[PDB]
Structures are given as C-alpha cells and as structure tokens.
Design a protein around this ligand. Structure first.
Ligand code: HEM
Ligand code: HEM
Ligand code: HEM
Ligand code: HEM
Lengths: 142, 141, 188, 141, 142, 188
C-alpha cells in the first residue's frame, strides 16, 4: 500500500485511540450480521441466531481482538503486506476456503465501525487513508 | 430480497435523516470521490473540489431519490425506471461504483447517526442499497 | 377570435411515478393543466398515444388558451409552463408558435429556458374537420442506434443527460412512449 | 431486474431442456466440483466421484427447482422460500458458489443446446440465474 | 497458474482448433451483451444498441482478435503471467480504469464461447483446465 | 366403535407452493386427504393455527378413519400416507399411536420410513367435550438458538437438512408455522 506521510499520520493518530477490546469484536460481529453466510466459518462459536446474540457472543469478541491485531500488524509493514500476511493467507485459503471477496467486506465493515466510533472525527480524508490500508490487507490475504 | 423487518428498519433509519438529506448525500459523494478517485471519471463536467456547490446540489438529488426508493421499496423497478434509464442505458455505470457509493452512504450514516446505526439496521440498509443498485444497473425496459 | 391548444406532451409524461417522465407545473398566462375528463376535445387523440407500461390512472393535459390565429395557419399562444425532468430544476417553456402549411409541413416552436426559437417537432401532416385541427408530428421509425423523435434544437438545448427523457438507444415500449403526442387545436 | 424479453427468453430456452433436465443439472454440478474444487466442501456426505448416482440424483433436484423458478419467475421469493431457508438459513452458502454453479449451468447449456444459446438468451439466463441466486442467499423470512 | 502436464496438454490441443477470426469477437461481443455496462469502455465502436448490432460490429470483431491474441500469449508464459501482462495491466488500470471484476467476467464469457463452439468436446476436465488459465490471466491483469 | 383423527400436520404444510412445506400424497388404509370444507369437525382448530404468510387458498386435512380406542385413552389408526419434503423422495408415515393420560400427558407416535416407535410430539394437554378430544402438542417457546417444536425422535430420523422443515434458528412467522398443529379426535 502507498500512503503519503500525511495519510500515514492520519491513520496512526486515529489507530492510537481505538478501543482494542471492542472495535474488533464489533467489526467481526457486524460482518456476521450484515453478510450472514460468513457465520458458516464460525459455526462452533455458539448462538449467532440474532444480531444481539452475535454481538454479545464472547467468542465473537475474543476472535475480533485477534482480527484487529492483524490489521494493526499491517500498519507496521505497509510496504510488504504480502510477505507479512503470508501465513494467514495460507490459513484462510488452503485451510479455511474463505472466498477473498469476504476480506474486502470485513475491511469495509471495519471502516463503518471506525466511523461509528469516531463520528465527525472520521473525516473524508481520514476514511480515504483507511481505504488504502484495508484494500492492501484484503489483497495481501487473497 | 428484503425481509419485512429490513423494510421497517430502512424506513425508520432513513426517516431520521430528514432535513439533513442533502448534507448526507453530499458528504457520501465527497467520501466516494476522495476514497475511490476512479468514480470521479463519471463526473468530468463537475467542479469536484471540496465544498463544490455542484457536488452539494447533486447530493441533494441522490438523497431525494433514496427517499423515493424507501417510500416505494416494494415497487422500486417502476418507481425508479427513469433513474435506471439514466444509470444503466445512458451512463452505463459499472456496478462496482454502486457498492462504493453505498459503502460511503453507510459510513456517513454511521458517523452522523450512531444511535440509529445498530448492527440490524446496518444489515437492512446494506441490502436496501444493494436492491436500489440492482435496479439502477439493470436494463428492464 | 381565438384557438385553444390541447397537448399531452408525450406518453412518457403520464407515468404513474411523475419523476419518470416530463412533469409540468406553474402553468400561467392562459396555460392550464386540465384533467382529461374536462378536455374532451383531446379524448380521441389521447387514447391513441403510446404510453409507458406503468401509466398514471388519472391524467392532466396541457391546455393553452387565448391563442391568436392568422389564416396555411400561424398560431401563437401566450401561455407559460414549468417542465421538470426527474430530479432537475424546472425549465420554463413559453411562446408556443405553430406554423402549418400545404397540409403536410410546418412545426411547433417554443422558448425553452433562456433560448428562443427552439423547434420542438416538425409537422408530418395536419387535417381540419369542423373547427378542429389535428396535428401529427414527424417521427422517424425506431430502427437501430440512437432514436430521436423530437427536433435536435430541443435535445441540443437540454444536453445529453436531460435528453434521456427525449431519446433512446433502444426501441422498447417505454422509449417509444417518449415521442411527442399529436396536437388538437380548437378554433373559436 | 428481468425485462419482459428476458423472461420470455429464459422460458423458451429452459423449455428446450425437457427430459434432459437431470442430465444437464448433473453435468453442471460435475463441472462445478471439478473446475472449482472448494464447492465440494458443501457436500462432504456425497460420493463425489464421476458418474456418482448421488450427484446424478442431486442434479435432477437442482434442474427441477430451476423449472419451478422459471414457471414462477415473477414470484420467486414466495415460490422458492424453503430453498432460501435451506441455502441461506441452514447451509449458509457463500454467494460466490452460486456464481460458480450458474456459470457451469451456462457452459452446459452452451455445449448441449448451441442453437438456443444466442447472445440475447445467454444474457437473459445470466440475469435469471443471478435473481435465483439472490433469492436462495437472502434471509427474507 | 499451475496446470498439470495433462491439463496443459488438453488446453493446447483445444486452443489449436480455435477459429482465431471469430472466437475473440464472440467473447468480446457476448461480454458487451451480457454485462452491458462494459459497452462504456467501447463507446467509440459505434452501434451497440442490440445484440445483433454488437455481434456484427466490425470494430468488436477486430478488437476481439486482439483480446484472443493476449489469452494465447498467456498460454506461452503460464509460470509468469504477472510479468507477461505487466504493460496491459498498466493500460487497463492506470489508463482505462477497468474494474478487475470485468476481467473475470470476460474469462468466463470466453469459457462459454469455447463450450458453444466445441460442444461435447468441451468436457468437464477440459473446462477445469481452462478455468485455471482464465483465472490466471484475470489475476495477472488485475 | 371407532375414532377419526383430524390433523393439518403443521401450518407450514399449507403453503401456496407445496414444495415449501410438508406435502402428503398416496393416503391409504383409512387415511384420506380431505378438503377442510368437508372436515367441519376440524374447522375451529384449523383456524387458530400459525400459517405462513404465503398460505394456500383451499386446504386438505389428513383424516384417519377406523381408529381403535381403548378407554386415559390409547388410540391406534391403520392409515398410511406419503410425506414429501421439498424435492426429496417420499417417506411413508403409518401406525399412528396416540396415548393420552391424566389430562396433561401422552404423545403421538408413528412409524416414519423404516423406523418404528418415532415420537412426533409430546402432549401438553387434552380435553374431551361430547364425543370429541382436542389434543394440544407440547411446544417450547421460541426464544433464541435452535428452536425445536417437534420431538427429537422425528428430526434425528430425518437428518439435518430434511429437519429444516421441522426446526429453525429464528422465530419468524414462517418458522413458527413449522410447529405441529393440534389434533381433533372424534369418537363414534
Ligand atoms: C480480512 C481480514 C481478516 C484478517 C486480518 C483475519 C485475521 C485472522 C487471524 C489473526 C486469525 C487467527 C489465526 C491464528 O492465530 O491461527 C484468523 C482466523 C480465522 N479467520 Fe480470519 N481474518 C480476516 C478475514 C476473515 C474472513 C472474511 C473470514 C470468514 C468469512 C475469516 C474466518 C476465519 C476463521 C474461520 C478463523 C479460525 C477461527 C477459529 O476457529 O478459531 N477471516 N483470522
Ligand atoms: C444509490 C445510488 C444512486 C442513486 C440513488 C443515484 C441517483 C441519481 C439522481 C437522482 C441523479 C439525477 C437525475 C436527474 O436529475 O433526474 C443522478 C445522476 C447521475 N448519477 Fe447517480 N445515483 C446513484 C449512483 C451513482 C453512481 C454509483 C454513479 C457513478 C459513480 C452515478 C453517476 C451519476 C451521474 C454521472 C449523474 C449525472 C449528474 C449530472 O450531470 O448532474 N450515480 N443519480
Ligand atoms: C480479461 C482479459 C482481457 C484481455 C486479455 C485484454 C486485452 C487487451 C488488449 C490486447 C488490448 C489492446 C492493447 C494495445 O494494443 O494497446 C486491449 C485494449 C482495451 N481493452 Fe482489454 N483486455 C481484457 C479485458 C478488458 C475488459 C474486461 C475491458 C472492459 C470492460 C477492456 C477494455 C479495453 C479497452 C477500452 C481497450 C482499448 C480499445 C481501444 O479503444 O482501441 N479490456 N485489451
Ligand atoms: C441455481 C442454484 C441452486 C439451486 C436451484 C439449488 C437447488 C437445490 C435443491 C432443489 C436442493 C434439494 C432440496 C430438497 O431436497 O428439498 C438443494 C440442496 C442442496 N444444495 Fe443447492 N441449489 C443451488 C445452488 C447451490 C450451491 C451453489 C451450493 C453450494 C456450492 C448448494 C449446496 C446444496 C447442498 C449442500 C444441498 C443439500 C444436498 C443433500 O444433502 O442432498 N446449492 N439445492
């Protein structure tokens, strides 16, 4: 991903205020509610029958933390996302068979969650910079 | 295919937009042009600078069209036929661009109306904007 | 002493959802939007038009009163009306001028927005029975490529995207419905 | 959104399948499992070898469901609700798999019925299979 | 793209019987009819108002030959499609702004045209091998 | 001397498109598919059921004749019927055996396919008025997670995907409609 220093600055500043205990769980939970076929990959997580059961599920929250941790790892290696995400790419493709279109959907749900948490602070320039990051992570995973 | 609950969710959330319709439509377009610059190639005749009056006026038309689509959610091919004529037959907009604008409308709604943007409402708005996008990109004349 | 003009504009002006075809409002100076049941002189012409599949149940017709006739016919109306196309800002149409000659030539012109002398359509033919003139617009057959059933003056003034209401690439029913409807002129 | 001509095109082309319904459905499934092996993960309980009787019988059910969808093309959410219950609520099939099966059904029709597979008919079948796919992957209960 | 020697054999044998004057024009023409927003990129080609006008358009036939020529060039460099399609990738992205989903659609329309021309000879194994090739070309262009 | 059983099976067996719920055919040995207008003893129970939104205009009801009653009640019917679920091959349901005890316990059992002694549902309660027994199935409230309104014997015999007709993850109207309808037993 090619971000200008100002875009990298905007991304890093907003990422520093992210509640790492909730944002990941909210993005994963919203992926499961909005694109409901994604629940197939998480069948063992238990009750996913309603939006409230999904969002409040302890396994959804714990796994969402791991996902957010990986997006953060992408922020450290923007010029080599392919190499950084190599192991995860192998896991999601060869083992899990996740169609790569779902990686783009998860990145866009994460942008929505950031907008929902930050409101007016998630300005159009700040979103544009995050769009480069989430496209880079989804392409690296694919 | 929208469920009955999706329809009531979209009507309730879009009803909270009200007087801010143009403002939200303009912001969604601005977010689209800035995040996905290829979408600017559909508006070569526009002043695309930030705060452009042309972008503001266009945003009000987009928001008003969505208000009409919400009101006639069970008869959208008929209600939006001239918009399908423009987007599918004349402009021939690639359907990917509708996913981009729909995402930017969701982002704007999440930023401005956090109380309304519940996971259930986000899901219903996503399907609704996908159905509006299918109508505007299909040739059914 | 005068002439009344009756015109439904186009079949596409009679869609169930009024954003889907030309919509008229703010009629003045002798122009009036009249319910078809009260504009009986246009009843038979209106029933023969090509309308969209999703057609309005109760339609209004444009009626321009107090036209001046010079008898060949040269008729001018003082009426003005606002035409809205979809989500656009309105355009005033006024100074309707109809010239008819030799039973098979002539044209309907108007001022459209800030532009005067805009031909809306050329006349294919017209006939007079009693005190009524029936005017048929000259419309090319819809074959292939761009089909343009209105005069180029109109669409060149409107521009590419507002001309989506007045032209089409295809010959489907709802596109044929965009063509100008015939006129009925009642001489009094 | 299907046009009136799309509907008449799909009914005419699918009507030419007739007694070969099961054969074409079975071949489309075989083409899918072989071309896109990830789709096999939805059928772990099947014998997926070539000429498998289970794949043949399944192909006849898929083809019969498409015959019903063609017959009720203007009321598909109602006509196919139990298939939406199975595919969207129970199996939770990823929509990409429906694009894969739809492509393999098109390939089978092109191979077996070249006189019917005109560019116009190919276009109408593609939209029809996309609308059946949207119904079977949407939760509208 | 990783094809076994038998799959490469099946691809090469069928490709040798392809009518290079028609198949390309049919694939491009069918792309324009089936996915009609693709006509936006070829506005200067003239009459595309009906399926017959599209299929019979001389510019559609001539351009389709060029497209088929590029897929053939991919058959020569299956182990380095990214490097081979580098110039075309730059042309379709930086200059033409073609969304990469259209490359997948064109590859699938080309598979349909091969099936339409070869009938029973376009067997499920032969299609599976062509699917690896068209995915590789579309990914290389993206 | 005998008992007739009236049962609509489930509200979901009355979808406008019969592939969308259980469908019955090939009734024999005293079982009969009867139009609701000719099975008046079931009229009031049938009207109180939960049906899908897209409901059939004219419905048939299962009627099992020549039941044997031992009076607590133990009633057995000789009837057999074929049940088709969607696009599946039919399954014969036969040997219906109803046990009722203490006004609030009991169950309806059947042979389903090659498996005998399959409980279809447990009885929540039953009442007798004149020569008619009204039997109410025991159905758990639909709250969250997997909702199973039929006995586990039935769904475990049917398997995961055929059990989509008998259970749901959600509490939507069309899912509630899958629950067993009450029985009406007429003693003669
Ligand atoms: C696009 C961004 C994504 C990122 C950054 C991401 C990251 C991760 C990480 C860090 C793990 C744990 C790896 C390990 O410790 O072994 C994981 C596991 C997993 N992911 Fe993703 N993932 C993404 C998208 C998806 C999508 C879209 C799906 C499915 C729709 C998915 C399904 C799974 C599953 C099923 C597991 C295993 C969980 C379990 O059973 O414990 N992932 N992912
Ligand atoms: C939710 C989806 C959309 C809605 C509701 C929508 C609605 C509208 C409306 C109401 C108009 C004005 C029509 C009139 O004046 O009658 C319009 C025009 C237009 N739309 Fe869209 N649109 C959508 C998506 C898109 C997308 C994704 C693009 C391209 C990236 C696009 C490009 C255009 C263009 C170029 C015009 C002409 C603008 C002008 O010249 O003023 N639209 N649209
Ligand atoms: C996926 C496989 C594709 C291949 C192998 C391919 C190949 C080519 C080739 C060989 C050229 C000519 C390059 C030159 O000589 O300068 C070309 C040009 C072009 N392609 Fe593609 N292309 C593909 C897909 C697409 C798609 C999907 C679109 C649009 C929907 C598209 C639109 C164009 C346009 C607009 C030109 C320029 C034509 C002109 O104006 O002369 N291409 N392509
Ligand atoms: C055109 C699209 C499709 C149609 C019309 C269709 C139709 C059907 C039908 C009729 C059944 C049997 C239902 C019954 O017995 O009542 C079925 C079952 C099933 N479908 Fe589909 N289907 C489609 C696409 C898919 C796709 C894309 C997948 C996954 C790759 C899939 C996976 C399944 C599975 C796993 C079953 C259960 C099979 C069994 O256990 O016998 N379906 N489908």
């Amino acid at each position: 991903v090619h971000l200008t220093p100002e875009e990298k600055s905007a991304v890093t500043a907003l990422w520093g205020k992210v509640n790492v205990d909730e944002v990941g769980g909210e993005a994963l939970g919203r992926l499961l509610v909005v694109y409901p076929w994604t629940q197939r990959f998480f069948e063992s997580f238990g009750d996913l029958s309603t939006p409230d059961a999904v969002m409040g599920n302890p396994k959804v929250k714990a796994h969402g933390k791991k996902v957010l941790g990986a997006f953060s790892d992408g922020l450290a290696h923007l010029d080599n996302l392919k190499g950084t995400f190599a192991t995860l790419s192998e896991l999601h493709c060869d083992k899990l068979h996740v169609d790569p279109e779902n990686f783009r959907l998860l990145g866009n749900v994460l942008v929505c969650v950031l907008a929902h948490h930050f409101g007016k602070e998630f300005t159009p320039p700040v979103q544009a910079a995050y769009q480069k990051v989430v496209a880079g992570v989804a392409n690296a995973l694919a | 295919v929208l469920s009955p609950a999706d329809k009531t969710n979209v009507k309730a959330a879009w009803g909270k937009v009200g007087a801010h319709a143009g403002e939200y439509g303009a912001e969604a377009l601005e977010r689209m042009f800035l995040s996905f610059p290829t979408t600017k190639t559909y508006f070569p005749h526009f002043d695309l600078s930030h705060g452009s009056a042309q972008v503001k006026g266009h945003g009000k038309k987009v928001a008003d069209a969505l208000t009409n689509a919400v009101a006639h959610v069970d008869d959208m091919p008929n209600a939006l036929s001239a918009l399908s004529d423009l987007h599918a037959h004349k402009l021939r907009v690639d359907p990917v661009n509708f996913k981009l604008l729909s995402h930017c409308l969701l982002v704007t709604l999440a930023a401005h109306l956090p109380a309304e943007f519940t996971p259930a409402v986000h899901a219903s708005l996503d399907k609704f904007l996908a159905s509006v996008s299918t109508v505007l990109t299909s040739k059914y004349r | 002493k005068n002439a009344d003009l009756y015109w439904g504009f186009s079949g596409s002006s009679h869609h169930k959802y009024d954003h889907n075809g030309p919509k008229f409002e703010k009629a003045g100076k002798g122009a009036e939007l009249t319910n078809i049941d009260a504009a009986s002189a246009y009843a038979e012409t209106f029933k023969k038009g090509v309308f969209p599949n999703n057609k309005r149940e109760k339609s209004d017709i444009l009626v321009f009163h107090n036209g001046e006739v010079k008898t060949s016919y040269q008729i001018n109306w003082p009426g003005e009306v606002t035409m809205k196309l979809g989500y656009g800002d309105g355009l005033v149409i006024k100074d309707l001028n109809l010239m008819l000659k030799n039973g098979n030539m002539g044209e309907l012109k108007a001022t459209v927005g800030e532009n005067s002398n805009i031909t809306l359509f050329d006349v294919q033919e017209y006939s007079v029975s009693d005190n009524t003139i029936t005017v048929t617009p000259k419309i090319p057959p819809c074959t292939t490529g761009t089909w343009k059933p209105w005069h180029n003056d109109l669409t060149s003034k409107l521009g590419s995207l507002k001309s989506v209401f007045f032209e089409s690439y295809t010959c489907n029913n709802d596109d044929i419905a965009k063509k100008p409807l015939p006129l009925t002129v009642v001489l009094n």
